[PDB]
Amino acid sequence: NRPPFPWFGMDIGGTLVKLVYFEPKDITAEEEQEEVENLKSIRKYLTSNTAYGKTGIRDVHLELKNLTMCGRKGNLHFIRFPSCAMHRFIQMGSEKNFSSLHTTLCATGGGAFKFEEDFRMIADLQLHKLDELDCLIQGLLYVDSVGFNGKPECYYFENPTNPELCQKKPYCLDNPYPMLLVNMGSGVSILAVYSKDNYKRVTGTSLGGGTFLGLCCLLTGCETFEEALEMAAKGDSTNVDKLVKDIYGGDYERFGLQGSAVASSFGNMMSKEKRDSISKEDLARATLVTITNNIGSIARMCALNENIDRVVFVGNFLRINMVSMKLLAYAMDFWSKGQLKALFLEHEGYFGAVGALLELFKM
Amino acid sequence: RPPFPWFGMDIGGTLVKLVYFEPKDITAEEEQEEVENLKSIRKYLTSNTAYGKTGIRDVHLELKNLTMCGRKGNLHFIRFPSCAMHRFIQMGSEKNFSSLHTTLCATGGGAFKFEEDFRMIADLQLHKLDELDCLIQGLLYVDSVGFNGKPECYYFENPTNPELCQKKPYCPYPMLLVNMGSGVSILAVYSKDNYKRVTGTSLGGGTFLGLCCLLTGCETFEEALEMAAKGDSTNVDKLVKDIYGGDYERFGLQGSAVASSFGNMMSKEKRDSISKEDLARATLVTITNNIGSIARMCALNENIDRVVFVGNFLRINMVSMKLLAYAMDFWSKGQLKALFLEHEGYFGAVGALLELFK
Ligand SMILES: CC(=O)SCCNC(=O)CCNC(=O)[C@H](O)C(C)(C)COP(=O)(O)OP(=O)(O)OC[C@H]1O[C@@H](n2cnc3c(N)ncnc32)[C@H](O)[C@@H]1OP(=O)(O)O
Ligand SMILES: CC(=O)SCCNC(=O)CCNC(=O)[C@H](O)C(C)(C)COP(=O)(O)OP(=O)(O)OC[C@H]1O[C@@H](n2cnc3c(N)ncnc32)[C@H](O)[C@@H]1OP(=O)(O)O
Ligand SMILES: [As]
Ligand SMILES: [As]
Ligand SMILES: [As]
Ligand SMILES: [As]
Ligand SMILES: [As]
Ligand SMILES: [Cl-]
Ligand SMILES: [Cl-]
Numbered sequence A: 001n002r003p004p005f006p007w008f009g010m011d012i013g014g015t016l017v018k019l020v021y022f023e024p025k026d027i028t029a030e031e032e033q034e035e036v037e038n039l040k041s042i043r044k045y046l047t048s049n050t051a052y053g054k055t056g057i058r059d060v061h062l063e064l065k066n067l068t069m070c071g072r073k074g075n076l077h078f079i080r081f082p083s084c085a086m087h088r089f090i091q092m093g094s095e096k097n098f099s100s101l102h103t104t105l106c107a108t109g110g111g112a113f114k115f116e117e118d119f120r121m122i123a124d125l126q127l128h129k130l131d132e133l134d135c136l137i138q139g140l141l142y143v144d145s146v147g148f149n150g151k152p153e154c155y156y157f158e159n160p161t162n163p164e165l166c167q168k169k170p171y172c173l174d175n176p177y178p179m180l181l182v183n184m185g186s187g188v189s190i191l192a193v194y195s196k197d198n199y200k201r202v203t204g205t206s207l208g209g210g211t212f213l214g215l216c217c218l219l220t221g222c223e224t225f226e227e228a229l230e231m232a233a234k235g236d237s238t239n240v241d242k243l244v245k246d247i248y249g250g251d252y253e254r255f256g257l258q259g260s261a262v263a264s265s266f267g268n269m270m271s272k273e274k275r276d277s278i279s280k281e282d283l284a285r286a287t288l289v290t291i292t293n294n295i296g297s298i299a300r301m302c303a304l305n306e307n308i309d310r311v312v313f314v315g316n317f318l319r320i321n322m323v324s325m326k327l328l329a330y331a332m333d334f335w336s337k338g339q340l341k342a343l344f345l346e347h348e349g350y351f352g353a354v355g356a357l358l359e360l361f362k363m
Numbered sequence B: 001r002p003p004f005p006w007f008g009m010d011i012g013g014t015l016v017k018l019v020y021f022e023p024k025d026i027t028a029e030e031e032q033e034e035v036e037n038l039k040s041i042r043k044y045l046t047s048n049t050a051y052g053k054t055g056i057r058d059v060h061l062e063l064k065n066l067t068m069c070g071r072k073g074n075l076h077f078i079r080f081p082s083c084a085m086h087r088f089i090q091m092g093s094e095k096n097f098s099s100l101h102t103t104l105c106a107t108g109g110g111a112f113k114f115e116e117d118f119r120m121i122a123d124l125q126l127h128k129l130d131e132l133d134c135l136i137q138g139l140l141y142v143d144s145v146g147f148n149g150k151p152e153c154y155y156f157e158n159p160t161n162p163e164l165c166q167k168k169p170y171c172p173y174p175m176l177l178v179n180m181g182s183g184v185s186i187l188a189v190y191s192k193d194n195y196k197r198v199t200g201t202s203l204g205g206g207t208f209l210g211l212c213c214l215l216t217g218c219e220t221f222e223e224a225l226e227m228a229a230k231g232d233s234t235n236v237d238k239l240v241k242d243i244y245g246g247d248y249e250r251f252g253l254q255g256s257a258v259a260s261s262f263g264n265m266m267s268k269e270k271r272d273s274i275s276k277e278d279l280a281r282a283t284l285v286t287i288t289n290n291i292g293s294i295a296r297m298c299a300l301n302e303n304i305d306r307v308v309f310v311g312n313f314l315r316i317n318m319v320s321m322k323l324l325a326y327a328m329d330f331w332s333k334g335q336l337k338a339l340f341l342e343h344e345g346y347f348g349a350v351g352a353l354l355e356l357f358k
């Protein structure tokens, strides 16, 4: 009972859309004959272009080559466009008569509901909405099972906080189970994954990327995450936080605490004098450090409680650059006394769309 | 047997705590053989609840029918503000305390400030003791004797529902002790001679005050907590129900759970209409919910099922305590209670008194 081509999955965000497409490479002479024109041209449209209209982009470097999907050999392609271009996408769906190939389209993402009726009225498609976390996890595990063209899908950072020594290093453990997934959007969900068909949300924290943005907008008068990060990257949090060395003069060995460990986040801001001279850049950085250090702590304690040694970090909170990621890397190493690393994934951001595609094969 | 009277002191930045063991088994002959200086100090302490201008004996906290170094009697809890300290030392000199003891056991971060005045004005040497050691010994001692046949320990039931909220009692080792100052340190206490700091968080009272001041223009703990008491955090935080239109059924996460602390403040429109009290309350709820989670996880890591909260962050307004109670309740799915202690504030003084016998 194999679903017919073409095979797509989508992740429709509030601001960003991701689309994944499987290109079959093993199409028989018999199949090529019975295939309708509509399909033939979408397939050639997808594979001969890497830019689609004003905003569509195929990330060629992410292409997974020579894999198996539902018993067929081919390649997986990763495409992106902003949500504002979505009306044009749905209009493309109508012009290319997509409904003649499929009545439905699998999609996850917080933006999906916004567009469900447009899909029906403009393209005569049913958007079949899926859970973000189930899609993420299924997509992640699939991409990890097939590998990144013989290279590792996973990576970590060595000496993250020292830009003189910081280095992305691959992590080639073939068997990822069990693992802990730390999903950081506006809030944070932490899932133990024991197998493809066996996982559960163990806990989470409300102190996430939206706390970071909410607090910076309030504290610094910025409006976007990009602004918040740009300030958080030039800042010095030690002006805002009271450190152990400020209380004890150095380490406090009795408590196993080094001088550079934070005693109280925002502790300097209890003084009116210090508040009146603090920089917008320092407040932003302090906000980011507080949140990343706290996520590292909670991730470490969960890893211990669940007896899991692999902690994988994904989510919106990690996009734009690597400031977030390197601070989480530092935090994980701190709380774990060097015994756990923060692990990250090359295909981060596309896992939802891959999990949506995979829904096609559930029967 | 050390001679009477038996005192312990904890001298803090704003409050001084004093505990006093009143012996209730004085013989007719002991009474005949006791110097006048002692007899009148005992009469003074026991016949008064107001001492000088600012001194208060808190009769509610009194422990009756204790035995202490083999004498039957009562322990009394007394306090006065630090600015009355000059008057207290003069009182010791006028009442000739040095004729009874040459030294006095004291802890607290102002035992150093006043050591010189004690020596010069009252001819008394302060024997200064470590704050943490005194806290632990006192806490453990008070828990071991109980509160007049009732538990020293209590929790709140239905903490955030004022119509339902009930302070209920809880009837030992090991326990986790969450000590909240400017930061939070968590200690595993296995017995009275063994405790170790197991972990903590830099997100505590200090973060609450610093963030409140920055967000609202307030300046003090008392002011931040009064605002946080009046505000509504749900205007500031994004709740699970905001995202899913109710519970997130897939993972059984309640609609009322907070999804993203300060998450509504990502919206310019929402920022322009928020009250400062709502921000204050969101700041507190964020900090306490988080402390709740770290404490719960630490209990799990340690296989310890008893979690006690103490520290100056609890004293100023009871709002902190109710939120911690709700948090522990939430993270443990009702399996762990936030435990609080009736004699909180005085444990250091009790620990100091106990040193008199070692
Ligand atoms: C007692 C207590 O409550 S203790 C606290 C306990 N709370 C918990 O354990 C829950 C912790 N939080 C979580 O687990 C997570 O936040 C979840 C699972 C609830 C939600 O997951 P998140 O990753 O935070 O959701 P996400 O960031 O995607 O937000 C959802 C959607 O809201 C919308 N959204 C995102 N940002 C904004 C914004 N700035 N403004 C308006 N809407 C937005 C988007 O459509 C987003 O979808 P998208 O990211 O696909 O584009
Ligand atoms: C990567 C990262 O950094 S993640 C963050 C990791 N950080 C942590 O885990 C630490 C979290 N914080 C904590 O555990 C606590 O804040 C501590 C233990 C550091 C400090 O204890 P707090 O209860 O917050 O004390 P607070 O900061 O309120 O005041 C410090 C007290 O220590 C006292 N002190 C100073 N030196 C000493 C000493 N040598 N011996 C005993 N006490 C001392 C100070 O005088 C002060 O006393 P006071 O209140 O009487 O004036
Ligand atoms: As299949
Ligand atoms: As991995
Ligand atoms: As004794
Ligand atoms: As107890
Ligand atoms: As109550
Ligand atoms: Cl497959
Ligand atoms: Cl679950």
Ligand SMILES: [Cl-]
Pocket (backbone or CB within 6 Å): A136, A347, A348, A349, A350, A351, A352
């Ligand atoms: Cl993803």
Ligand SMILES: [Cl-]
Pocket (backbone or CB within 6 Å): B011, B012, B013, B014, B015, B016
């Ligand atoms: Cl005090």
Ligand SMILES: [Cl-]
Pocket (backbone or CB within 6 Å): B135, B343, B344, B345, B346, B347, B348
């Ligand atoms: Cl105390």
